[PDB]
Amino acid sequence: AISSVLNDILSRLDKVEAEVQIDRLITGRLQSLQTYVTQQLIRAAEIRA
Amino acid sequence: CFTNVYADSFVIRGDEVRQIAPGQTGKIADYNYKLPDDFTGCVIAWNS
Numbered sequence: 791a792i793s794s795v796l797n798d799i800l801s802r803l804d805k806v807e808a809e810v811q812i813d814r815l816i817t818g819r820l821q822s823l824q825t826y827v828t829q830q831l832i833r834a835a836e837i838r839a
Numbered sequence: 840c841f842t843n844v845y846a847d848s849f850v851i852r853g854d855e856v857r858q859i860a861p862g863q864t865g866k867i868a869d870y871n872y873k874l875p876d877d878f879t880g881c882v883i884a885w886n887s
Contacts, residue, residue: 805876806862 791815847872856884 791814793799799811851859851867858867861878874880 804862804864 850887853886856882859884 791799791811792802793811794815796812796815799808799815803811849872855865855867857863858865859872859874859882861874862876
């Protein structure tokens, strides 16, 4: 995406184009939490054992 | 098939057709005829 900041998209692009950038940022940030939580779930299985 | 259907009827300059398409800008796209962000439908235009 064109920026790491949400408003630096919105104050530049318009509705259908911000929707393209912001879906790149959502897809990757959601992937970042699915990764963090997967790490913590594997790491939880250690601290349990 | 369709739940309800409408035919919105008007006349414009031949160049302003690009402005009718959903998610545009220009006076026609901004001050007189705006199609929504999910416009399910068709734009039909011809020099008359």
